[PDB]
Amino acid sequence: MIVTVINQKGGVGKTTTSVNLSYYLSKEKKTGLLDLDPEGGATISYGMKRELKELPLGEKSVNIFNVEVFPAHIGLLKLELNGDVEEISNKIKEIGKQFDFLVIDTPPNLGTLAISAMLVADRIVSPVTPQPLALEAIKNLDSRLKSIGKNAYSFTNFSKKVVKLDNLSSVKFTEITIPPSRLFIEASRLGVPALRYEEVRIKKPKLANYYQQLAKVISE
Amino acid sequence: MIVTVINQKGGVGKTTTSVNLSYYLSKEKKTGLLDLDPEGGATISYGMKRELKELPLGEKSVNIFNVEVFPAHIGLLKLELNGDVEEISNKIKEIGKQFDFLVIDTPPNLGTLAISAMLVADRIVSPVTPQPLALEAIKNLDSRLKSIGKNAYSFTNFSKKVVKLDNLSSVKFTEITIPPSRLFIEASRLGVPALRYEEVRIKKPKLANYYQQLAKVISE
Ligand SMILES: Nc1ncnc2c1ncn2[C@@H]1O[C@H](COP(=O)(O)OP(=O)(O)O)[C@@H](O)[C@H]1O
Ligand SMILES: Nc1ncnc2c1ncn2[C@@H]1O[C@H](COP(=O)(O)OP(=O)(O)O)[C@@H](O)[C@H]1O
Numbered sequence: 049m050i051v052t053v054i055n056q057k058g059g060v061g062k063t064t065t066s067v068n069l070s071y072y073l074s075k076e077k078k079t080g081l082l083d084l085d086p087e088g089g090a091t092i093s094y095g096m097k098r099e100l101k102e103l104p105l106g107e108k109s110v111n112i113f114n115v116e117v118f119p120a121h122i123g124l125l126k127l128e129l130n131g132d133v134e135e136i137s138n139k140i141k142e143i144g145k146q147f148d149f150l151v152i153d154t155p156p157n158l159g160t161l162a163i164s165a166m167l168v169a170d171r172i173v174s175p176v177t178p179q180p181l182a183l184e185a186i187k188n189l190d191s192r193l194k195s196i197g198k199n200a201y202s203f204t205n206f207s208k209k210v211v212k213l214d215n216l217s218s219v220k221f222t223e224i225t226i227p228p229s230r231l232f233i234e235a236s237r238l239g240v241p242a243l244r245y246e247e248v249r250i251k252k253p254k255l256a257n258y259y260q261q262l263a264k265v266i267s268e
Numbered sequence: 269m270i271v272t273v274i275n276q277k278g279g280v281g282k283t284t285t286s287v288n289l290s291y292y293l294s295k296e297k298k299t300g301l302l303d304l305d306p307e308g309g310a311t312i313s314y315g316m317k318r319e320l321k322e323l324p325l326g327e328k329s330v331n332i333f334n335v336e337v338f339p340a341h342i343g344l345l346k347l348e349l350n351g352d353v354e355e356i357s358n359k360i361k362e363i364g365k366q367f368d369f370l371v372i373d374t375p376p377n378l379g380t381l382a383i384s385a386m387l388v389a390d391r392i393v394s395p396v397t398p399q400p401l402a403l404e405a406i407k408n409l410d411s412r413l414k415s416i417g418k419n420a421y422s423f424t425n426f427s428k429k430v431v432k433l434d435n436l437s438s439v440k441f442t443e444i445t446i447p448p449s450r451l452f453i454e455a456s457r458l459g460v461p462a463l464r465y466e467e468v469r470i471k472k473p474k475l476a477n478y479y480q481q482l483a484k485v486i487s488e
């Protein structure tokens with residue numbers, strides 16, 4: 049199944065969601081994480097680096113922490129300017145047909161790669177935050193979803209209180225809410241998924257519940 | 269420069285030394301880790317798995333945590349069986365040619381891959397514990413070094429007291445003694461080097477001093 053994480057505004061926790069949700073899913077099922085953002089955030093969250101070579105989409109992958117990560121590369125940049133969304137879409141589907149779950153990380157916009165990842169996604173997932181820029185972003189994403197006729201789940205990040213906006217009929221706001229935590233910044237200094245770092249840093253993990261509920265909700 | 273970690277008995281810290289020392293050398297210089305153990309200890313130590321493909325020696329490499337790790341693969345099992353020591357040696361020289369430091373993990377024996385990595389190693393290091401069978405292994409390694417005309421540096425693991433033996437004119441015993449540490453098991457369970465774990469696990473780095481010292485003892 050294809051899980052695409054969408055948000056036209058950066059810093060909302062999109063890469064964190066892709067990385068940690070893919071890792072949580074890897075535990076019982078064969079999971080891949082395809083990194084479509086040229087920044088390569090999700091590539092960095094697995095201890096790696098953006099390839100400074102213009103590579104074909106999906107040709108290269110490395111299995112880190114039992115996740116098949118397709119690392120980011122500068123080839124995306126050209127795709128992200130003059131790409132053919134049908135061909136990237138078919139490529140994403142052809143890769144996903146080898147995984148129980150393919151989580152896709154998208155660049156901070158709604159361009160060619162975001163459209164490619166959205167039209168073939170089985171589920172679209174948007175993080176949301178209380179500051180007003182993410183609120184304008186999610187409202188515009190609802191118009192995106194309608195004009196393409198697609199759904200998207202949403203969940204609240206960087207907060208203790210859950211964010212809900214009820215005129216958005218193509219965005220279902222779940223109850224899931226993730227508060228700030230040392231774990232994210234520490235694991236990012238490490239360059240590992242936050243869940244995996246939690247597995248050994250503390251005894252009773254608290255981050256696993258968020259991504260567990262996210263997985264259960266999208267699996268419906 | 270090529271560094272080969274050698275030991276006949278498993279469980280002394282061979283992989284742990286390879287991983288941590290290579291990561292330490294990556295701080296300033298271009299460093300590679302060649303995993304020649306078919307079991308893939310160092311490979312696991314970087315969050316990867318051994319390839320179930322018969323790859324050629326030193327073709328797959330991933331940059332994990334600033335280190336060019338060459339993962340273990342079943343092809344090693346072929347080379348360990350009937351590999352020509354000379355050809356394996358020349359290959360290892362090719363692999364290490366482009367690296368300021370090439371650290372090599374070896375299997376728990378003195379077989380084909382191990383002898384091939386010693387015959388070309390610029391320096392050879394052999395961890396020792398105060399365990400009877402490890403004390404025996406260092407004597408056997410002194411024997412094999414004499415048979416092939418090479419030297420090795422030893423240091424103590426799993427102990428606060430340094431181990432030293434007499435009439436082993438081929439192994440220099442250094443004052444470096446590494447004490448037990450929870451950080452080691454935790455970096456194992458997480459799957460990263462321990463010097464990178466303690467980079468965030470604490471505030472005043474502790475384990476890096478021993479590799480700081482070991483680099484100095486083996487560089488002069
Ligand atoms: N719930 C959270 N609590 C604390 N820090 C977070 C949280 N979510 C994300 N971060 C931090 O925000 C930074 C950037 O977030 P990221 O996931 O890259 O967002 P995006 O990819 O959408 O820009 C990361 O360093 C991450 O550690
Ligand atoms: N100083 C230490 N204190 C505690 N545990 C250690 C120490 N050094 C290594 N270990 C643990 O011992 C286990 C085996 O060590 P390893 O280096 O793989 O042995 P080998 O030399 O057989 O490869 C690893 O799980 C590692 O975490």
Ligand SMILES: [Mg+2]
Pocket residue numbers: 062063085087089090
């Ligand atoms: Mg990002």
Ligand SMILES: [Mg+2]
Pocket residue numbers: 283305307308309310
């Ligand atoms: Mg081992």
